[PDB]
Amino acid sequence: LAPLADGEKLYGKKGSEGTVTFTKAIGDNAFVEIKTGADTGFMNGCLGFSESIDGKNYWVAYVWQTKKSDTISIDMSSPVQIAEIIGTETQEVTDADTIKKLTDKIKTEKSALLQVWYASDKTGKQIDPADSASESIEVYIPSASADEA
Amino acid sequence: GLAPLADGEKLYGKKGSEGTVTFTKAIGDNAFVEIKTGADTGFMNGCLGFSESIDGKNYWVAYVWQTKKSDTISIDMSSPVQIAEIIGTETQEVTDADTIKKLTDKIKTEKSALLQVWYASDKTGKQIDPADSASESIEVYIPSASADEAL
């Protein structure tokens, strides 16, 4: 739950459309490493996942935020936005049974979506597009060596 | 503003890194998502995403699309289906019609959007991971100013 050492980090490879792909399952913990721009005062975004349970499709997001260059720890058991996609409509899921099933399935995934949503400068003015507010954004999980501890 | 347009009236957005799409003018009332599916793909969905702010409060707004084959989907910028207010690292669903209109008005003046693929399955119903691999191309366009004179 705290930032790691630069030898136990397993970085995900960034694709197109903000995909991040790992060589193994994500597991319990992912870390988002953010290097902000000099004129940036605030950023937020998420890690996104889509899962399916007998006919029903769900979208699941873990939200992060920061005011400076930092590494944010994300607990894969604690998603904050869970929606079921019925056609082109969404329905919010509050059922604890359904949610656990989704998180268990998410922990076995090898890829995620990384999105920046909003960003503002030191004076509170919005930066558009938000992605331009960062100099770099990466995601890593712990190594198998670091998991033994 | 719902039937797909001819090649000379389309204004394509330029795709960036984190699935950003940028236009040389404001998006306005209508955006179209042009999708070429893969041969083994039976279903896809995703969205166009926007973030706006209203005196202190930040909102995330999404317009959801879906398809079962290569097609162009029309998205009405006045009809978002998921609107959340971001309080810290928590979300709250917005149902207030006044707040929603304020957001859509602001969204229509934007020159960029986020394009995301969420889920995809093959002909036999099995999930494709990552979902983005199910498409051969995905683009977004808005009408030209010439096509807008067509009231």
Side-chain angles (χ1 to χ4, degrees), chain A residues 17 50 80 90 92 115 117, chain B residues 51 81 91 93 115-116 118:
Chain A
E17 306 279 30
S50 86
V80 307
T90 57
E92 192 190 338
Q115 304 164 22
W117 290 348
Chain B
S51 85
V81 307
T91 57
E93 192 189 338
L115 177 70
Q116 303 164 22
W118 290 348

Side-chain angles (χ1 to χ4, degrees), chain A residues 5-85:
Chain A
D6 312 6
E8 302 101 79
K9 300 194 255 244
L10 190 77
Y11 283 98
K13 189 178 169 71
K14 292 181 82 176
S16 42
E17 306 279 30
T19 317
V20 179
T21 306
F22 297 87
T23 51
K24 63 171 186 192
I26 290 159
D28 295 349
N29 293 298
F31 302 76
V32 182
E33 204 175 3
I34 309 171
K35 245 73 166 71
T36 61
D39 281 20
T40 306
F42 176 83
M43 294 190 76
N44 66 14
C46 70
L47 284 178
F49 300 91
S50 86
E51 300 300 331
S52 200
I53 313 191
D54 46 60
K56 308 210 198 177
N57 308 325
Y58 301 84
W59 173 253
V60 185
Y62 303 78
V63 177
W64 53 264
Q65 68 173 340
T66 188
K67 289 158 190 301
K68 185 67 177 39
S69 308
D70 208 1
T71 298
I72 299 97
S73 174
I74 307 174
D75 187 45
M76 295 298 101
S77 311
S78 309
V80 307
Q81 185 169 36
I82 308 90
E84 196 214 327
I85 322 315

Side-chain angles (χ1 to χ4, degrees), chain A residues 88-102:
Chain A
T88 60
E89 300 292 350
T90 57
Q91 197 66 60
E92 192 190 338
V93 176
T94 55
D95 176 291
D97 212 307
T98 302
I99 291 161
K100 177 165 183 299
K101 286 163 155 280
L102 291 165

Side-chain angles (χ1 to χ4, degrees), chain A residues 14 16-18 50 52 57 59 65 80 83 85 87-88 90 92 109 113-118 126 128 131, chain B residues 15 17-19 45 51 53 60 66 81-82 88-89 91 93 110 114-119 127 129 132:
Chain A
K14 292 181 82 176
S16 42
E17 306 279 30
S50 86
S52 200
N57 308 325
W59 173 253
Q65 68 173 340
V80 307
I85 322 315
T88 60
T90 57
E92 192 190 338
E109 296 293 322
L113 273 171
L114 177 70
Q115 304 164 22
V116 183
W117 290 348
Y118 182 84
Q126 183 171 20
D128 252 307
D131 192 36
Chain B
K15 292 181 82 176
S17 38
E18 300 278 30
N45 67 13
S51 85
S53 200
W60 173 254
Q66 68 173 340
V81 307
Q82 187 164 52
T89 60
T91 57
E93 192 189 338
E110 296 293 322
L114 273 170
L115 177 70
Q116 303 164 22
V117 183
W118 290 348
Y119 182 84
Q127 183 171 20
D129 252 307
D132 192 36

Side-chain angles (χ1 to χ4, degrees), chain B residues 30-95:
Chain B
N30 293 297
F32 302 75
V33 182
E34 204 176 3
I35 310 171
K36 198 133 154 72
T37 61
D40 280 21
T41 306
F43 176 83
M44 294 190 76
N45 67 13
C47 71
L48 284 178
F50 300 91
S51 85
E52 301 300 330
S53 200
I54 313 191
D55 46 60
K57 307 210 197 177
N58 309 325
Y59 301 84
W60 173 254
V61 185
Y63 303 77
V64 177
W65 53 263
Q66 68 173 340
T67 188
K68 281 156 190 301
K69 47 76 185 304
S70 308
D71 208 1
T72 298
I73 299 97
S74 283
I75 308 174
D76 187 45
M77 295 297 102
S78 311
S79 309
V81 307
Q82 187 164 52
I83 308 91
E85 196 214 326
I86 297 69
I87 295 98
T89 60
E90 300 292 350
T91 57
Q92 197 156 52
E93 192 189 338
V94 176
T95 55

